C-alpha cells in the first residue's frame, strides 16, 4: 500500500537517472519505500488493449511462481503499475551473466525451469475460460532473492475457449510456425515458446546467434539431433558451469525438441512437460 | 468485507435473495455489518463472449471514477466464482422508480430532471476521458439507479467499449439506433440515442415498449406526434401522475429528445452539447 505522492518524488518526478529499462509499451522505474514500477507509455488504440490484459490477469490468478501486482495507480492522467523489485533480475540476465554475474548452477536451472512450468500450468487451466500467456521467454522470467522464478508480460495474453499487427516486436524469435504464417494462436504456443527457453537454460547462447550469417539457436539444436546426432546437441552445453550427468542433460533435448514443433499436433502439453520436467531433477543428483 | 462474507449473506446464493438476472449475471442482494449491498455474480453456465463482458465491467470500474457511476467496492475471485459487489442503492432503479412499482411516491420533476444531468454528466465524463474515450453502449433507465437522496448512478458497463467510427460482430435491443442494428456500427453518438430515449421515458412515465397487443414502441410513437401534430401534442403524453410542468419546461426537452434520439447518426448532438441544454433548462423549472 502506497500512495501517487510517494511515487511522484520516489521516481523523482520520473527521472531519466531513475529508470531501470524501457520495453514495448513501458518504461520500468526504480522506486524505494524498494519496488520496480511500469509506466503507460502515451495510439492508444493497441497500447491500452495490452495495459488492460496486463492488470486483467495479475488481479485475477495469483501464483508463487508469478510476479505479484503489489498496486495500481490511476492518476494525474498517468496509469502506471508497482511491483515487488526481483534481487536476481531477469533470467536472460542471469544465464548470459551481465555484469560478471555468478553462473547459475543446474539445480538452480532445472529449478526455475520447473518453477515456470507450474505456473503456465496453472493459467492453462483456469476455470472461466483457460488463458494463453503467449509473450514467455527467458526475458519476462524474473528471479527474487532466493533465485524462484516469476513470470511478467501478460500483455499479449488472451482467454481461449489472430492479428499479426498485434504482435510483440520483441517476442517474434519465440512465436511459432502457424502463429506467424497463419496467424493461428494455440493453447500450444506457450509449450513452443517454453521448449525454446529450455534450449537457452542447456546452451547459455542467445536467442539468435551471433554468428555472421545471423542464424537462430531453435534451427541449429533443431539440425543437430535430426541429423549428426543426439549426443552432438551436447556440444552446446553451458560451459560456464561444471558437467551434469549425460541423462539429465539428453531428457532436457529430448523434451524441448518436442515443445519446439513446428507441426502443432506432435507439441505436448504442460502436464506432461511438468511431469518429465521434476522426473529429470532426479536425475541429476543420483 | 471478505468472500466468506457473501456466501453466508446470500446462503449459497439461494434464489429468495437474487433481486435480479441479467443477461450474463446474476445480481443478489447481501446485507453484512449492519450494511447492506448488492453482489453481482458471472453466470458461469458461451465461454468467451460471457468473459469479455465480464471484463468490462471490471475495467472501468476500476479505472474511472465520477459520483454518478456506482462505485465497485470489492470485487472477489476464489472458489472460481467470480463476482463483483455495489453499495445498494436504496432508492431501487429509475425504471422502477418512474413505473412506481411498490406504489413509491411518483418522481417529481425537480429530482426527474436531476436524474437526467446527472447521467448526462457521467456519460460526458467516459466520452473524455485521457487514455481512450470509453462509450457505454448500455445506458437504460434500468441500468440507473437512485441513491439515498434521489441522485443517479450508472451501472452496466459489461458492453461498454474503448474507441480511438468502430464496429460490432453482431452476434432486447431497443435502446439501438438504426445504425447498430442494420450496419453494427458503434460510436460514440450511441449513447446519445439511447440517452434520448430515457428523456422519453422520463417525460412520459410510459415503459420503452408500450404493453398493448402490436407491442409498439415509446419513441415510434412520439415521432408520429411530433411529425404529424408537433409537439403540442407530444406534452399530452406528459406523466398525468404528477402536477403538471412548465411547458417551456417540458418543450425543451422533447426537442433535446428528439435530437438525442436522431435517426441518423450524424445529426444527434455531442453530449456536453445535452449537459449545456439541461442545466439551462432546470432554471426554467
Ligand atoms: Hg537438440
Ligand atoms: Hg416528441
Ligand atoms: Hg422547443
Not at 531513475?18 to 513501458?26: C, H, K, M, T, W
Not at 501486482?69 to 526481483?86: G, V
Request: net charge positive; hydrophobic share 40%; aromatic share 10%.
Amino acid at each position: 500500500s502506497i500512495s501517487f505522492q510517494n511515487i511522484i518524488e520516489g521516481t523523482r518526478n520520473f527521472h531519466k537517472d531513475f529508470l531501470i529499462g524501457e520495453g514495448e509499451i513501458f518504461e520500468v522505474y526504480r522506486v524505494e519505500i524498494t519496488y520496480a514500477v511500469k509506466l503507460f507509455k502515451q495510439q492508444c488504440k493497441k497500447h491500452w488493449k495490452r495495459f488492460l490484459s496486463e492488470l486483467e490477469v495479475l488481479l485475477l490468478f495469483h501464483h508463487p511462481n508469478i510476479l505479484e501486482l503489489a498496486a495500481y495507480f490511476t492518476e494525474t492522467e498517468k496509469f502506471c503499475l508497482i511491483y515487488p523489485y526481483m534481487r536476481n533480475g531477469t533470467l536472460f540476465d542471469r544465464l548470459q551473466c551481465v555484469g560478471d554475474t555468478a553462473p547459475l548452477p543446474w539445480h538452480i536451472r532445472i529449478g526455475i525451469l520447473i518453477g515456470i512450468s507450474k505456473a503456465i500450468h496453472y493459467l492453462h487451466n483456469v476455470q472461466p475460460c483457460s488463458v494463453i500467456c503467449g509473450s514467455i521467454s527467458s526475458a519476462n522470467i524474473l528471479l527474487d532473492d532466493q533465485f524462484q522464478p516469476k513470470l511478467t508480460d501478460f500483455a499479449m495474453a488472451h482467454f481461449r475457449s489472430i492479428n499479426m499487427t498485434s504482435s510483440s516486436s520483441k517476442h517474434l524469435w519465440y512465436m511459432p510456425e502457424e502463429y506467424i504464417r497463419q496467424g493461428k494462436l494455440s493453447i500450444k504456443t506457450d509449450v513452443y515458446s517454453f521448449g525454446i527457453v529450455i534450449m537457452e537454460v542447456l546452451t547459455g547462447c542467445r536467442v539468435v546467434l551471433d554468428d555472421p550469417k545471423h542464424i537462430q539457436l531453435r534451427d541449429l539444436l533443431r539440425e543437430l539431433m535430426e541429423k549428426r546426432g543426439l549426443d552432438s546437441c551436447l556440444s552446446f552445453l553451458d560451459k560456464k558451469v561444471p558437467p551434469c550427468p549425460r541423462n539429465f542433460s539428453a531428457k532436457l533435448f529430448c523434451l524441448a525438441g518436442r515443445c519446439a514443433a513446428t507441426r502443432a499436433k506432435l507439441r505436448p502439453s504442460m502436464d506432461e512437460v511438468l511431469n518429465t520436467l521434476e522426473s529429470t531433477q532426479a536425475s541429476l543428483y543420483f
